[PDB]
Amino acid sequence: VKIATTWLGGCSGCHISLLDLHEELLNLLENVELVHCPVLMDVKEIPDEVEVALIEGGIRNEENLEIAKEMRERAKIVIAFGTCAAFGGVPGLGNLYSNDELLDKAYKTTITTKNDDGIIPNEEVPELVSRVKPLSEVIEVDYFIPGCPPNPEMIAEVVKALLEGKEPELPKKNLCEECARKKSEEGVAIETIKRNYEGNPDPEKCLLEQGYICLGIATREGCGAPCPSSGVPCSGCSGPTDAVVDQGAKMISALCSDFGIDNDRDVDPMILPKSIKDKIGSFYKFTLPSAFVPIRLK
Amino acid sequence: VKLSVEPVTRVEGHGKISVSFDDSGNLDKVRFHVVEVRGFEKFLEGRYVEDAPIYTPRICGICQVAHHLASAKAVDNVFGVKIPETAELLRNLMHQGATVHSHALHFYMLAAPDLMFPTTDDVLKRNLMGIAKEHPEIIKDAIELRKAGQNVVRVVGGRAIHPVTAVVGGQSKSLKEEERDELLKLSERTIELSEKSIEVGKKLLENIKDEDLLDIGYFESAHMGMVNNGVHDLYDGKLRVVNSEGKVEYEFDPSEYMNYIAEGVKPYSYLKFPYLKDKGEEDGIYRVNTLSRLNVSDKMATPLAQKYYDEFVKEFGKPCHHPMLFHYARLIELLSSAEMVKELLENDKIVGEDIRAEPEEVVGDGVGCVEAPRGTLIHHFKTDDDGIITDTNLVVATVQNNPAMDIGVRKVAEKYIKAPEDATPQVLNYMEMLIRAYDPCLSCATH
Amino acid sequence: EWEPKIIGFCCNWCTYGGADTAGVGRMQYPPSIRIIRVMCSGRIEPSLILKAFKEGADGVFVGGCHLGDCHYDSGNYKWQRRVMMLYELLEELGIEKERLNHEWISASEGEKFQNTMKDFYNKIEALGPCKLKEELDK
Ligand code: NFU
Numbered sequence: 001v002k003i004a005t006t007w008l009g010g011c012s013g014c015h016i017s018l019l020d021l022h023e024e025l026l027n028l029l030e031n032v033e034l035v036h037c038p039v040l041m042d043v044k045e046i047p048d049e050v051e052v053a054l055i056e057g058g059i060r061n062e063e064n065l066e067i068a069k070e071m072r073e074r075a076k077i078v079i080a081f082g083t084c085a086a087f088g089g090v091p092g093l094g095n096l097y098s099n100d101e102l103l104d105k106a107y108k109t110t111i112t113t114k115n116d117d118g119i120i121p122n123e124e125v126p127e128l129v130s131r132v133k134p135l136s137e138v139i140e141v142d143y144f145i146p147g148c149p150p151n152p153e154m155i156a157e158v159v160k161a162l163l164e165g166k167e168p169e170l171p172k173k174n175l176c177e178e179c180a181r182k183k184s185e186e187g188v189a190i191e192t193i194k195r196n197y198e199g200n201p202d203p204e205k206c207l208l209e210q211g212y213i214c215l216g217i218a219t220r221e222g223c224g225a226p227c228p229s230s231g232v233p234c235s236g237c238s239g240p241t242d243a244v245v246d247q248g249a250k251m252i253s254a255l256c257s258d259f260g261i262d263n264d265r266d267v268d269p270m271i272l273p274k275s276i277k278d279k280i281g282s283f284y285k286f287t288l289p290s291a292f293v294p295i296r297l298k
Numbered sequence: 299v300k301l302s303v304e305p306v307t308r309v310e311g312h313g314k315i316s317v318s319f320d321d322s323g324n325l326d327k328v329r330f331h332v333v334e335v336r337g338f339e340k341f342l343e344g345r346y347v348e349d350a351p352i353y354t355p356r357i358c359g360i361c362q363v364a365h366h367l368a369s370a371k372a373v374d375n376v377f378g379v380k381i382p383e384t385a386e387l388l389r390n391l392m393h394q395g396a397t398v399h400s401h402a403l404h405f406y407m408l409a410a411p412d413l414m415f416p417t418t419d420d421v422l423k424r425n426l427m428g429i430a431k432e433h434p435e436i437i438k439d440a441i442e443l444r445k446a447g448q449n450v451v452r453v454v455g456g457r458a459i460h461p462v463t464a465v466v467g468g469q470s471k472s473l474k475e476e477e478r479d480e481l482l483k484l485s486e487r488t489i490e491l492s493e494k495s496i497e498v499g500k501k502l503l504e505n506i507k508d509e510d511l512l513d514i515g516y517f518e519s520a521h522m523g524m525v526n527n528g529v530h531d532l533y534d535g536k537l538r539v540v541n542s543e544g545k546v547e548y549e550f551d552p553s554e555y556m557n558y559i560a561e562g563v564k565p566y567s568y569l570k571f572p573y574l575k576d577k578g579e580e581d582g583i584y585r586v587n588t589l590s591r592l593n594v595s596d597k598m599a600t601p602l603a604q605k606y607y608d609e610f611v612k613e614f615g616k617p618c619h620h621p622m623l624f625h626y627a628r629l630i631e632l633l634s635s636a637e638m639v640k641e642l643l644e645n646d647k648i649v650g651e652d653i654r655a656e657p658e659e660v661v662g663d664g665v666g667c668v669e670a671p672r673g674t675l676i677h678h679f680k681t682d683d684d685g686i687i688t689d690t691n692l693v694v695a696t697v698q699n700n701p702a703m704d705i706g707v708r709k710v711a712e713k714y715i716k717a718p719e720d721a722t723p724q725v726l727n728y729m730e731m732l733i734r735a736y737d738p739c740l741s742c743a744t745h
Numbered sequence: 746e747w748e749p750k751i752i753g754f755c756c757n758w759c760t761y762g763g764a765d766t767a768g769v770g771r772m773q774y775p776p777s778i779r780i781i782r783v784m785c786s787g788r789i790e791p792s793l794i795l796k797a798f799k800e801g802a803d804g805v806f807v808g809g810c811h812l813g814d815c816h817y818d819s820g821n822y823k824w825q826r827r828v829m830m831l832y833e834l835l836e837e838l839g840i841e842k843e844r845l846n847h848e849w850i851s852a853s854e855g856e857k858f859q860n861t862m863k864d865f866y867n868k869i870e871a872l873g874p875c876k877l878k879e880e881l882d883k
């Protein structure tokens with residue numbers, strides 16, 4: 001089975017997680033004919049007759065667009081490999097600014113930068129597309145593996161399923177399933193909102209009920225919930241479940257519904273927006289390019 | 299005539315090499331282009347400053363620990379908090395484990411294919427699969443090193459890729475005595491494998507010297523690396539610059555980096571061109587990374603690495619300017635990090651519960667510095683009174699070898715190419731070998 | 746040459762009845778809005794508002810019972826908390842807060858519904874078209 005990988009606007013983390021199969025990477029490569037993979041081999045052009053393709057990263061520049069289209073033509077099955085390819089990922093926060101603001105910061109107004117003619121790199125380099133886009137927005141994507149990065153076992157199950165000819169199926173519940181923290185059977189009620197540096201979070205009580213914006217409730221399971229286990233709220237990196245399109249919108253709906261719910265008719269509805277200084281960054285860390293409004297208008 | 303090497307393969311990120319010829323057919327211009335940028339420095343504006351250790355690891359999937367720690371340190375200065383000692387050991391423990399994983403990843407899976415097969419036509423063979431089929435035990439040692447390092451990261455950081463435990467004022471969780479015990483049990487095997495890695499490195503660099511390839515991309519430069527009383531240190535100390543003759547030019551705290559470092563911009567690359575602003579663009583070229591850290595350090599911090607480093611200095615002197623000997627320095631750091639993992643796991647403060655101090659008044663300015671696997675890493679954040687980021691600047695490791703890579707690939711072309719017929723598949727791969735020697739991470743360098 | 750595209754969400758019990766009352770009373774108002782029926786204003790969530798802007802909405806209207814008069818007791822209180830966050834979220838996205846309008850309108854208040862539609866139309870008409878749909882289409 002000829003497979004190929006490539007990367008676009010990601011950070012290489014999905015490929016590193018693939019290598020974190022460790023011993024199993026060799027067993028995988030014994031059964032698979034890897035015909036293209038920039039990080040591991042020197043095949044420059046994407047060959048024809050690729051059966052499966054792992055594409056990491058979203059679309060950030062014109063070159064990403066052409067490679068995504070070339071891989072779609074060459075590959076039978078295109079897989080959106082990771083959260084960036086599936087939802088846009090952290091680089092999607094660049095949509096909150098124009099490319100000119102992104103470029104002028106990196107190449108003019110950064111404190112150590114020295115550029116006397118004020119040039120923006122433009123020779124032999126691609127221009128950025130207008131906004132970071134999920135892979136499915138520019139090509140047809142047959143499957144996707146969420147996670148930032150996707151855990152190594154999950155990458156193994158998806159691929160081996162396709163080698164066998166079976167459809168891969170991701171887990172469907174939200175994170176609270178896997179998480180070992182204890183909830184109130186009376187339900188979630190939030191009195192105040194705390195930034196993650198405030199107070200001392202109790203190790204066993206659900207962080208959302210303690211007042212911390214935790215994305216576990218709006219995030220698909222599968223990772224094992226290591227962040228809440230390790231003492232910090234979930235940031236939502238795995239993305240939403242199959243029944244939620246806009247992860248940030250749903251988290252906001254849930255958060256607002258239960259804020260002051262024990263005092264429903266009297267809690268001031270302006271306390272919650274005033275306590276959150278960075279709202280897009282609180283709720284759209286990994287998924288902004290796939291939200292209903294994936295940019296800031298200028 | 300114009301030739302292009304794209305993509306440059308077995309590196310992290312997107313780069314290409316251009317080779318152009320004039321009307322006579324003579325070599326004309328040779329350039330290294332990095333063709334990616336994402337703009338972290340700008341879109342970090344408006345975020346919660348305490349979320350910086352969440353965003354910046356997504357600059358790269360290889361060295362995500364280094365960014366996590368650099369941001370955490372900057373955040374720890376933004377708030378006026380001094381983290382307790384146990385937190386310091388846990389972060390450094392995670393830092394060494396990551397360095398083990400990164401150095402092993404590069405030498406074995408990215409670099410070694412060239413060192414083993416420097417003059418081959420079989421391009422499908424020049425990869426870990428080609429090494430694994432003829433020398434399987436070498437790739438299994440590589441895998442076991444990465445597995446040991448990532449395992450350290452996962453336990454201390456919560457995840458092997460993009461750790462989350464480094465929070466405002468220390469660590470979000472402590473290390474438990476049982477975890478400490480099995481990590482310490484496993485640490486001995488990592489050290490042995492690192493020693494064996496040095497020996498294979500000797501063999502393969504001998505093979506490189508046999509082919510007259512040990513001096514490709516050679517030029518002389520300054521060198522920068524963090525030292526702690528002149529002792530090689532990846533986590534704490536001051537940044538030391540040594541000139542091409544080995545003389546210490548300056549030693550400065552990373553918070554003053556802007557008074558010593560400047561980054562230039564050229565139109566043909568999204569990757570900037572740093573230099574010692576004092577010396578200028580041409581005379582101020584310096585390097586970072588494994589070999590640069592050895593040149594600036596008086597000694598290593600661990601005994602076994604000291605022995606190989608002393609033996610190496612005796613053979614090549616100080617400072618060494620050979621690009622390809624960055625590979626050997628990488629293997630010494632690989633061992634030194636392995637040893638440091640064990641040493642930190644033996645420090646009884648590693649399992650302390652006093653892991654975090656309450657954040658103090660917001661200073662509004664913080665610089666965080668660590669030696670990433672691929673060189674000095676600086677995170678500089680500025681915030682308002684609510685701790686909302688207003689400005690960020692990132693000087694990320696490999697960017698500081700971009701002049702070295704641009705110079706190197708043209709000096710490789712000068713040595714081997716006179717006419718377009720000389721740019722054979724093997725000679726073009728020589729140019730990529732010069733790139734790979736510096737272990738470039740181009741997503742990191744551009745951010 | 747250009748007319749605002751306005752989307753409305755009205756509860757079945759009070760506000761949808763106020764829009765019916767305006768129709769029975771022949772209370773003319775601009776033909777920009779289209780109303781989507783829900784049982785309760787508590788059924789309205791940020792994703793529905795954001796979805797409408799994505800589709801091309803120049804303005805978004807939501808109408809529910811007066812606070813306390815919810816046919817389902819307290820649905821509007823949840824909605825009121827969500828919309829206050831959504832106002833400031835729309836600003837972080839560069840969408841004018843004024844492009845979103847929520848009102849409490851009972852079934853008898855046909856006149857109030859009429860002037861609410863007129864005031865909102867003029868507000869959105871003066872703002873010009875929302876440029877989100879044309880940026881995503883680049
Ligand atoms: N090592 C490393 Fe990065 Ni992927 C680079 N270059 C770091 O901060």
Ligand code: SF4
Pocket residue numbers: 009010011012013014015056057081082083084085089090147148149150356358359
């Ligand atoms: S997903 Fe998380 S990891 Fe895989 S790439 Fe985008 S960022 Fe790097």
Ligand code: SF4
Pocket residue numbers: 175176177179180181205206207208209214215216217225228233234
């Ligand atoms: S913590 Fe985050 S995840 Fe674990 S439960 Fe409370 S919410 Fe669901």
Ligand code: SF4
Pocket residue numbers: 148215216219223224225226227228233234235236237238
């Ligand atoms: S927890 Fe929230 S964040 Fe930590 S991993 Fe599972 S998802 Fe990504």
Ligand code: FES
Pocket residue numbers: 756757758759760784785786787809810811815816817818819820821
């Ligand atoms: S039914 Fe009209 S607001 Fe609840």
Ligand SMILES: [Fe+3]
Pocket residue numbers: 110339691692693694745
């Ligand atoms: Fe920078």
